Design a protein around this ligand. Sequence first.
Ligand SMILES: C=CC1=C(C)/C(=C/c2[nH]c(/C=C3N=C(/C=C4\NC(=O)C(C)=C4C=C)C(C)=C\3CCC(=O)O)c(CCC(=O)O)c2C)NC1=O
Ligand SMILES: *[C@@H]1O[C@H](CO)[C@@H](O)[C@H](O)[C@H]1NC(C)=O
Ligand SMILES: *[C@@H]1O[C@H](CO)[C@@H](O)[C@H](O)[C@H]1NC(C)=O
Ligand SMILES: *[C@@H]1O[C@H](CO)[C@@H](O)[C@H](O)[C@H]1NC(C)=O
Ligand SMILES: *[C@@H]1O[C@H](CO)[C@@H](O)[C@H](O)[C@H]1NC(C)=O
Ligand SMILES: *[C@@H]1O[C@H](CO)[C@@H](O)[C@H](O)[C@H]1NC(C)=O
Ligand SMILES: *[C@@H]1O[C@H](CO)[C@@H](O)[C@H](O)[C@H]1NC(C)=O
Ligand SMILES: *[C@@H]1O[C@H](CO)[C@@H](O)[C@H](O)[C@H]1NC(C)=O
Length: 306
Amino acid sequence: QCVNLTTRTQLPPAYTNSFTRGVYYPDKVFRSSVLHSTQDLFLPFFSNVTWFHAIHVSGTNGTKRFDNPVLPFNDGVYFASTEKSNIIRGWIFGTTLDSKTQSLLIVNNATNVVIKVCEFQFCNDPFLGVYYHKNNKSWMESEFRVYSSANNCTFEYVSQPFLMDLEGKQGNFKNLREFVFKNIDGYFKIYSKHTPINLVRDLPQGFSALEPLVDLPIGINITRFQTLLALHRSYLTPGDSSSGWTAGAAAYYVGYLQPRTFLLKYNENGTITDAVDCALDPLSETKCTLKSFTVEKGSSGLEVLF
Ligand SMILES: C=CC1=C(C)/C(=C/c2[nH]c(/C=C3N=C(/C=C4\NC(=O)C(C)=C4C=C)C(C)=C\3CCC(=O)O)c(CCC(=O)O)c2C)NC1=O
Ligand SMILES: *[C@@H]1O[C@H](CO)[C@@H](O)[C@H](O)[C@H]1NC(C)=O
Ligand SMILES: *[C@@H]1O[C@H](CO)[C@@H](O)[C@H](O)[C@H]1NC(C)=O
Ligand SMILES: *[C@@H]1O[C@H](CO)[C@@H](O)[C@H](O)[C@H]1NC(C)=O
Ligand SMILES: *[C@@H]1O[C@H](CO)[C@@H](O)[C@H](O)[C@H]1NC(C)=O
Ligand SMILES: *[C@@H]1O[C@H](CO)[C@@H](O)[C@H](O)[C@H]1NC(C)=O
Ligand SMILES: *[C@@H]1O[C@H](CO)[C@@H](O)[C@H](O)[C@H]1NC(C)=O
Ligand SMILES: *[C@@H]1O[C@H](CO)[C@@H](O)[C@H](O)[C@H]1NC(C)=O
């Protein structure tokens, strides 16, 4: 199954700013119109998050990137993709990421979401592949080169089937897909949010809390993860299995959760509509001390009594 891709070019690591993204609902308490202070694993506001690309730049020896490095998991991850052609397909999570230990696979293979925990012998360069057939103008799922063996499976879920749109699109990124992953006491917890966007780079500023998606009772150690991307092949990408491919444009972003005290605002319906990262700056420390999003002195004059 495994193919080590060639023709990637060198590019320095790149970064962007997380603004106030990545807040998620840290519990399932029923709330209405209250602020709640809680210490949990959060992405600090205005974090320097790492920016990864799938891109094939025009020109002679134009930059060609298909970024699927193995990355640390640390205490949990914020993951965001900015998409127009459904290039990010999922992730693998584990330790050795080989047959010596169990790993978690979460992947959209164009017809199903697949969630499996096995002793996987993952490929060094795992990827999925789409083929564009010129004569009927059809984009079809063609390659699944993620692992060469899978043994002793302890968890398997396969969603109801679908047919995902695989067309490489023109224009700006249109879909923002955000995830928080935590691995707590044997449970792999996923929070997520999908948002319409219209941008070519960076992350949008507007606030959105990620909602609980699922808790997987899988009981495995996780210290590393690796993103699964789909490449494209066609009559325009001549070469062999390693070289005859291109990347449809996509970007994704990785930040790391750490222990933080956040003040969360729940509106009339229990939606988290704003948050303060208490340790961000003196203004945020002031808000958390006052248990308030507003710090301005009032004009009642009643302070002198109490
Ligand atoms: C990681 C890759 C990934 C892909 C390729 C993806 C595609 C994708 N997700 C959708 C909905 C959705 N997708 C999911 C969840 C998932 N769907 C998945 O493929 C995976 C792996 C998860 C989560 C682990 C959910 C719950 C919805 C409904 C969310 C909504 O519409 O608000 C839809 C149909 C509605 C739309 O266009 O917004 C697409 C095309 N989403 C992703 O997160
Ligand atoms: C891919 O490269 C790695 C490291 O260079 C090597 O160990 C592995 O055997 C290669 N696999 C294939 C299929 O070429
Ligand atoms: C983000 O972190 C990297 C790694 O240390 C650093 O090189 C880069 O300058 C940082 N960017 C900003 C804007 O602080
Ligand atoms: C995706 O995975 C499911 C579950 O393993 C499998 O049944 C299905 O055939 C796969 N899709 C394709 C296009 O191979
Ligand atoms: C397009 O043609 C290819 C090659 O004949 C075929 O595999 C594919 O199923 C076709 N797609 C459609 C939608 O007919
Ligand atoms: C399968 O994995 C589980 C968890 O790692 C382990 O307890 C069990 O012994 C394994 N079975 C094998 C390796 O045959
Ligand atoms: C995970 O690793 C820790 C120490 O690194 C160990 O105590 C624990 O038993 C491991 N769990 C599994 C399921 O292998
Ligand atoms: C809250 O719920 C009501 C209906 O119960 C709905 O009309 C409203 O849009 C929701 N959101 C806000 C911010 O009020």
